[PDB]
Design a protein around this nucleic acid. Structure first.
Lengths: 171, 57, 146, 183, 51
RNA sequence: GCCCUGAAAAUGGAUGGCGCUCAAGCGUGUUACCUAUACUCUACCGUCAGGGUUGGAUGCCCUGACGAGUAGGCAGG
RNA sequence: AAGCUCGUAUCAGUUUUAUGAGGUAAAGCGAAAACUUUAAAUAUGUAAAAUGAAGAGCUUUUAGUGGGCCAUUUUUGGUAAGCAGAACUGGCGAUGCGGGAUGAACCGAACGUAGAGUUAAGGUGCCGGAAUACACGCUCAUCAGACACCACAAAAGGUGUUAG
RNA sequence: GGAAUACUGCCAGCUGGGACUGAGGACUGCGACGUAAGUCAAGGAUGCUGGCAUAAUGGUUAUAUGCCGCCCGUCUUGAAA
């Protein structure tokens, strides 16, 4: 959907003679809090055998992008499952927010590796501060001084069935 | 009424049954509580030494 | 639509006796009114008895009536039989008593009158005791019909 | 509640909210091809036709029942506005085994007066605050006959979990939007 | 003979709820709450803005 | 991941057809829209049920819920 | 179906509580995995809180019936491969309606006569009601693909293309 | 440092257009507005107006058009043929 980023903090279930559990925190990209909590429980169990009943979510907050209208190069480390084993992937995404980059990554995974939301785990999203630290050329290409490109073959939308002139694809 | 299980849990390799011990104890306890009554009738998580920790795959 | 019980299930209680006796229908009408407008369980008992079939309304003997009246505190009560009162030559002494019944055989009626009582119908019973006060309603033996 | 959350934020504590005690369940599937144990639990919850809703008090036993009927229901945590609209528009009382609309406060007082419920808003209070007489009041309410949602279910296929883009299961606070669409 | 929705018919609303008049007159549906200036703790801000 | 090869005969034929190629194909996301004897509301018919009826009572009044069906059963015509 | 009894009855294809069960090896922590104390419940019993329920128990009676097919699940034994023997639970039989172009076992949903509204499954170029919608990618097949697929040809071959 | 806006939710906030329905038949009820008189959208439609008074509406029938609809009964087996 339209993704949001949630910080989710959970812990073990308190018991007698058991104070101060290990406060496990995670950052989950999900359309809503119900899905975020389910994903948190799933990842917690995968990390360590902590069932949903054996745990408790003590906090969940929505994290907004700090400078939402600044263009940022993001490196995204993920891992996803298939019929073959799990694979680790590094991707570079140029966008103005982490949620936008994560949505782009989910769509790219679906289009390329046929993977889905339940199969992708987002290990880390980080802004790459220096231009020189980028690796993928499909991102490094848009970083040159005085970048300019045309948009050849413009296709205009027609509201009516019939047009009374041949269309031009000029731009 | 007894238990059956080789040394798979048949109620009704044997031992005596304990399937009504709680019921009998509660009957006696409720009688005692009735006699006693007749005679006279969101938590919070703080952070001081624990901080949320980033442990992810 | 996922019904937990049977649809269009008839209750089971009765409204019309199978008999086409006009006088029986009149008695049933009177006691339907009485059991509706009176909260005395006697009227409901009599009304329910008015619907039973012949095999379910066995006769009651004058000996049975006299033995019932032999109870202490029950000598002056009026005995009610929703059914036939039959005679019994095995009793040689009969008390004075008032009996309400659907039908009296000739011998039973003669015995009651000779002992000095009266035989009344169930509508006369309704007039005298609208709630069935000081009544003793009897049922005859059943398993005799085998 | 709001100020307690703010105080926890200011002090650096984490305000853990109270566990929900009331749930609203709507039967989502039809009466064909249901396995016997789930259909028994549905009958016990009084969900006997599709788009039929009831209130359920949350205990361990009811929690396990809800886990059993998960594939065939949508349930969540109802809000005061949702409960108020439900009772005002589709509230019917079970009186002498008959389905009687709640058109006046006298109807409620004659049957729930023993429990101290004098009006429709007292009944709503007894529902929202799961109170001493919640069982009697909830059973007095006839099961709610909801229509299909105006605007659809918002999914192409209903019979997946809400988590996986479907309709069934626990949707928590989204039950309010669904139920108001169905009201 | 006919059920009327209290959410649409104002007469039935008042009949079933005498407090609807006070609610509407005092605008309890648009109650402007008193303000507070509490700020979240610095540890909370850092945890929210940390990875 | 998608694409080609990764064998298949024999009347002319089939993603249902037409046709479709930045699709009208494949993966995925968000909305809108279409329509079942299903759901909601109303009217009406019948069945059943629960209340009332001393002033066609096999009736009359009020209210609620229901309505698939072979063998077979019961009832009214 | 008829009688008798009672209806703060009598229960339930459901959960919970206490008492059992493959102790199968992840408890943790012991005398040096060989010890022998524990734990969320997949999966059945007994007995007592939740939810629901206006009919229940007993005694006499009357009709029709007396095959199976398909699938899920577990289990024991097998083949090149299919599979066979059990037990459970569903579907069908007696069953119309929407959808899958079409149809015994597929997806929805069970049916009094009508009106209005909303939907399910499935769809929205045209046939044909409904976006030649919006968005990000991939693919060009000298008989693509539009599916039964967590199936068979399937082990691989390719100086096709994309992303790792 | 000060705002604004988005998003999500609430209102017993206001207001416009469209469609289907009008069951019931003296009164009785619960309410609303009023110092009262009384009035009201409060236990189900009334008011005003026009044309026609007959094949005009409608029925019946023959056809046409759109969609749908396989030929009945028996008998077998789950079932179909």
């Amino acid at each position: 959907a339209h993704f949001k980023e949630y910080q989710v903090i959970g812990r073990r279930l308190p018991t007698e003679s058991v104070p101060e559990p290990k406060l496990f925190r995670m950052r989950i990209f999900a359309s809503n809090e119900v899905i975020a909590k389910s994903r948190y429980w799933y990842f917690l169990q995968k990390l360590h055998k902590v069932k949903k009943a054996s745990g408790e979510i003590v906090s969940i907050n929505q994290i907004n992008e700090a400078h939402p209208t600044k263009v940022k190069n993001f490196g995204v480390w993920v891992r996803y499952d298939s019929r073959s084993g799990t694979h680790n992937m590094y991707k570079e995404i140029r966008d103005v927010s982490r949620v936008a980059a994560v949505e782009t990554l989910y769509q790219d995974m679906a289009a390329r590796h046929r993977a889905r939301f339940r199969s992708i785990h987002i290990l880390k999203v980080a802004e790459i501060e220096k231009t020189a630290d980028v690796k993928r050329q499909y991102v490094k290409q848009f970083l040159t001084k005085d970048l300019k490109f045309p948009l050849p073959h413009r296709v205009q939308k027609s509201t009516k069935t019939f047009s009374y002139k041949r269309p031009s694809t000029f731009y | 009424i007894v238990d059956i299980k080789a040394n798979q849990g048949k109620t009704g390799h044997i031992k005596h049954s304990k399937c009504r011990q709680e019921f009998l104890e509660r009957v006696k306890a409720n009688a005692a509580k009735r006699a006693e009554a007749k005679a006279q009738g969101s938590r919070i998580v703080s952070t001081e030494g624990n901080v949320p920790q980033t442990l992810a795959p | 639509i996922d019904h937990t019980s049977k649809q269009h299930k008839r209750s089971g209680h009765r409204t019309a006796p199978k008999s086409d006796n006009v006088y029986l229908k009149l008695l049933v009408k009177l006691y339907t009114f009485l059991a509706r407008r009176t909260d005395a369980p006697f009227n409901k008992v009599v009304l329910k008895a008015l619907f039973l079939s012949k095999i379910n309304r066995p006769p009651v003997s004058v000996s049975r009536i006299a033995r019932a009246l032999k109870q202490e505190g029950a000598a002056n009560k009026t005995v009610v039989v929703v059914g036939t009162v039959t005679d019994d030559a095995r009793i040689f002494e009969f008390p004075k008593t008032t009996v309400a019944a659907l039908r009296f055989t000739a011998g039973a009626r003669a015995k009651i009158v000779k002992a000095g009582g009266e035989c009344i119908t169930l509508d006369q019973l309704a007039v005298r005791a609208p709630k069935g006060q000081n009544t003793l309603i009897l049922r005859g033996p059943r398993n005799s019909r085998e | 509640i709001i100020q307690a959350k703010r105080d926890a934020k200011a002090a650096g504590s984490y305000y853990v909210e109270a566990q929900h005690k009331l749930v609203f369940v709507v039967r989502i599937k039809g009466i064909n091809k249901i396995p016997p144990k789930p259909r028994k639990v549905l009958q016990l919850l009084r969900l006997t036709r599709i788009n039929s809703g009831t209130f359920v008090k949350v205990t361990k036993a009811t929690l396990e029942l809800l886990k059993l009927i998960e594939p065939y229901v949508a349930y969540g945590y109802p809000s005061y506005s949702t409960i108020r609209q439900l009772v005002y528009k589709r509230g019917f009382g079970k009186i002498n085994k008959q389905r009687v609309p709640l058109s006046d406060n006298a109807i409620i007082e004659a049957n729930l007066g023993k429990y101290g419920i004098l009006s429709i808003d007292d009944l709503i209070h007894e529902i929202i605050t799961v109170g001493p007489h919640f069982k009697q009041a909830n059973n007095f309410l006839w099961p709610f006959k909801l229509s299909n949602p105006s605007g659809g279910w918002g999914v192409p296929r209903k019979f997946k979990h809400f988590i996986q883009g479907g309709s069934f299961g626990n949707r928590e606070e989204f039950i309010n939007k669904l139920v108001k669409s169905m009201n | 003979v006919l059920k009327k929705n209290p959410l649409k018919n104002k007469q039935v609303l008042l009949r079933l709820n005498p407090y609807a008049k006070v609610f509407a007159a005092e605008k309890l549906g648009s109650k402007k709450a008193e303000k507070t200036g509490t700020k979240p703790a610095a540890v909370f801000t850092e945890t929210l803005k940390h990875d």
